[PDB]
Design a protein around this ligand. Structure first.
Ligand SMILES: NC(=O)C1=CN([C@@H]2O[C@H](COP(=O)(O)OP(=O)(O)OC[C@H]3O[C@@H](n4cnc5c(N)ncnc54)[C@H](OP(=O)(O)O)[C@@H]3O)[C@@H](O)[C@H]2O)C=CC1
Ligand SMILES: NC(=O)C1=CN([C@@H]2O[C@H](COP(=O)(O)OP(=O)(O)OC[C@H]3O[C@@H](n4cnc5c(N)ncnc54)[C@H](OP(=O)(O)O)[C@@H]3O)[C@@H](O)[C@H]2O)C=CC1
Ligand SMILES: COc1cc([C@@H](O)C#Cc2c(C)nc(N)nc2N)cc(OC)c1OC
Ligand SMILES: COc1cc([C@@H](O)C#Cc2c(C)nc(N)nc2N)cc(OC)c1OC
Lengths: 165, 165
């Protein structure tokens, strides 16, 4: 029914952790630069909690915030209240990026076409997790080692998976 | 249609620069010795401008120069004038290396199977760039840190990517 490509953009550790105390458990500027390059010129779909943690509209992209709050407004951002409203706002979009967090990943899980997942080889303490996924019917179309140095202190890989018809 | 493996051999910076004033923007003997090791015993496909910058046939490899000039000749080198002519000269080769520069990288881009790309972590001034590449259906099959020392003054990594069928 929807015409835009629904993509997931996420980074997670060995146990699927994505967050701790409403922020990122790791600081990886190189990973963030890859995120910015990939998502540039495409809508970002983020949960209300996810947005407030970031604190600011991310440049060069349509920021769409998902909340049940019927009176929620933020300057320089669009607000949706359901999967369908998001699909309406993004009717004509080429590809959208579901950007998190867990509640929003859950919401859009039945609709994912493509998965951009960074895997981080470390066991972080966390409270927020990326939902399990049946990877049957999925093909890995890209993999590469991320940059490890003084500023990026963990081992990590970029993966991209596409669903088959 | 063709049976030889078409490989790219290239070194570029953070902004895809490969050249400046018909020359290399950096001097990396260690990177050059990896190039010689990998390409040895395999044909080199070079654009006319790339060849003349080098100035001499590179030993142990078939040097094949790509030009539109029908009366162009160089001692100890073969001269092709098109993608297909290169394919004819290399019909029986196991693996050929597209060696640059930009115009020749463009020419053979639709045919690349394997990419040997050195990434140099520095922002050089340059005029010649390595073409953008959709890496969908490519996988990194090798990565390693290059040697940094007094003789090799930059941070750089060797990457190898293979196309998937
Ligand atoms: N490492 C990574 O790749 C990522 C990690 N994160 C991390 O995840 C955490 C945030 O994720 P999480 O706590 O799951 O929160 P979310 O980002 O999923 O936001 C939760 C909010 O989304 C709204 N919401 C949820 N379901 C619906 C619905 N069905 N209809 C309308 N609105 C809905 C609600 O807003 P409301 O209460 O206003 O009604 C809810 O409070 C942070 O720690 C963050 O750092 C986030 C993104 C990526
Ligand atoms: N960093 C790296 O990995 C590398 C860097 N380089 C750098 O790049 C620069 C050279 O690149 P660039 O300027 O693009 O030159 P090229 O090496 O790509 O050579 C261009 C020439 O190739 C010939 N040519 C182009 N298209 C065709 C075609 N379709 N059919 C037949 N012949 C064709 C033409 O020759 P003609 O005019 O004679 O007809 C043209 O002038 C230099 O600065 C060099 O140092 C080069 C290789 C690698
Ligand atoms: C709390 O602070 C942030 C939280 C997020 C989060 O929304 C995310 C993510 C995110 C990350 C990190 N990586 C990948 N591969 N996909 C994602 N979707 C982003 C940020 O910068 C942009 C943040 O500022 C520092
Ligand atoms: C004008 O000076 C040169 C220019 C080139 C260029 O053709 C190249 C390259 C090249 C390099 C450096 N690295 C990688 N990974 N791939 C390449 N294709 C080579 C040279 O030595 C052989 C040069 O002499 C010093």
């Amino acid at each position: 029914h929807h015409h835009m490509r629904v993509s997931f953009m996420v980074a997670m550790d060995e146990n699927r952790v994505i967050g701790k105390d409403n922020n990122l458990p790791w600081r990886l500027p190189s990973e963030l630069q890859y995120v910015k390059k990939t998502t540039m010129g495409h809508p970002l779909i983020m949960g209300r909690k996810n947005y407030e943690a970031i604190g600011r509209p991310l440049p060069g992209r349509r920021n769409i915030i998902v909340t049940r709050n019927e009176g929620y407004h933020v300057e320089g951002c669009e607000v949706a209240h359901s999967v369908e409203e998001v699909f309406e706002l993004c009717k004509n979009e080429e590809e959208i990026f579901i950007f998190g967090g867990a509640q929003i990943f859950d919401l859009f899980l039945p609709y994912v076409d493509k998965l951009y997942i960074t895997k981080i080889h470390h066991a972080f303490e966390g409270d927020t997790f990326f939902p399990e996924m049946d990877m049957t019917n999925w093909k890995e179309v890209f993999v590469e080692k991320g940059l490890t140095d003084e500023k990026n202190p963990y081992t990590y890989y970029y993966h991209v998976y596409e669903k088959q018809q």
